[PDB]
Design an enzyme around this catalytic site. Structure first.
Site, short mmCIF file in Angstrom:
data_model
loop_
_atom_site.label_atom_id
_atom_site.label_comp_id
_atom_site.label_asym_id
_atom_site.label_seq_id
_atom_site.Cartn_x
_atom_site.Cartn_y
_atom_site.Cartn_z
CB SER A 12 -9.26 -8.78 0.02
OG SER A 12 -10.10 -9.80 0.53
CG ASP A 72 10.38 -8.75 -1.88
OD1 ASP A 72 9.16 -8.89 -1.65
OD2 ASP A 72 11.09 -7.84 -1.36
#
EC number: 3.4.23.22
Length: 330
Positions: free
Chosen positions: A199, A35
């Site tokens: 992004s 994770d």
């Protein structure tokens, strides 16, 4: 040193991925959920409330000659889906794909929430976010990656998740045969303890690319892709009959639909998520309403590039002094 381990979907929807991990002496192999959005290595164990164990493989410290109680240390964690666990702490030898750390904090669960109990295929979590998020008290502990880092050939690990198929976590090296083209690297903020990056924008299907900064985390521990409501609305508007359902808890769409791809930007580069990756199947057995793999982050408080996004790429988690993230197509 290096390590390399195969990671396998837990079910037909890729809801999560498990990777075998050797703990203790002799080895006890548990299948853990790697994770990159948390920083605790915790396991089902011989200390876990018996009624809260249902099929998991447990770690038994008393059977490990190298286990030592970390005296006084406790841990308690809650995740973004509302699940939680807690217990005490041992140090022991932990090996992933041939890579061995001695003195790793292994957090032994005394309690787990129902979600964990109900998932028989996940024996625990192995956190790969930054150690600043680790919940051990009064002495915070390091992640497996942080402990291994100095021994690694290169201070990196990579995530290569499969679509309906096994993939790979590598530690200490970049497999240049595992991706196509070049790797595009992008800046990381560690200020919140996550692999947090920005992004450069998105496209829906064959649509034009929209340049726009989307701050988010690379999180292998989250199933879906969570993005701003504007973005998610623009995507689902291209699917006939798609709608947001508060009763279901997100966007659903007719199972008869063909989903468009979704592209996200990494600097000047582009990662394309095929439409099939965004299908998470009937909301309930036999239903003709299907659950979408792109959902709104509104009310999460952060955008999450979860498995839906990450499995479309070869992803480098670069833990150099100044960390960065790299993405390649594959």
């Amino acid at each position: 040193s290096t390590g390399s381990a195969t990671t396998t979907p837990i079910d037909s929807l890729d809801d999560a991925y498990i990777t075998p991990v050797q703990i203790g002496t002799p080895a006890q192999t548990l299948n853990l959920d790697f994770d990159t959005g948390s920083s605790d290595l915790w396991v089902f164990s011989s200390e876990t409330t018996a009624s809260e164990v249902d099929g998991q493989t447990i770690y038994t410290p008393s059977k490990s000659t190298t286990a030592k109680l970390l005296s006084g240390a406790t841990w308690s964690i809650s995740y973004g889906d509302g699940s939680s666990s807690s217990g005490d702490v041992y140090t022991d030898t932990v090996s992933v794909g041939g890579l061995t750390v001695t003195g790793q904090a292994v957090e032994s669960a005394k309690k787990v929430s129902s979600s964990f109990t109900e998932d028989s295929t996940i024996d625990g979590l192995l956190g790969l976010a930054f150690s600043t998020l680790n919940t051990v008290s009064p002495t915070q502990q390091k992640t497996f990656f942080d402990n291994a880092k100095a021994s690694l050939d290169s201070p990196v690990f990579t995530a290569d998740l499969g679509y309906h198929a096994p993939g790979t976590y590598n530690f200490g090296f970049i497999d240049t045969t595992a991706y196509t083209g070049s790797i595009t690297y992008t800046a990381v903020s560690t200020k919140q303890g996550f692999w947090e990056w920005t992004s450069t924008g998105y496209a829906v299907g064959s649509g034009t690319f929209k340049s726009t900064s989307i701050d988010g985390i690379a999180d292998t521990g989250t199933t879906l892709l969570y993005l701003p409501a504007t973005v998610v609305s623009a995507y689902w508007a291209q699917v006939s009959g798609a709608k947001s359902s508060s009763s279901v808890g997100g966007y659903v769409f007719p199972c008869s639909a063909t989903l468009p791809s979704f592209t996200f930007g990494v600097g000047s580069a582009r990662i394309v998520i095929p439409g099939d990756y965004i299908d998470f199947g009937p909301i309930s057995t036999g239903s003709s309403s299907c659950f979408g793999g792109i959902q709104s982050s509104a009310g999460i408080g952060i955008n999450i590039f979860g498995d839906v996004a990450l499995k479309a790429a070869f992803v480098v988690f670069n833990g150099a002094t100044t960390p960065t993230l790299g993405f390649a197509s594959k």
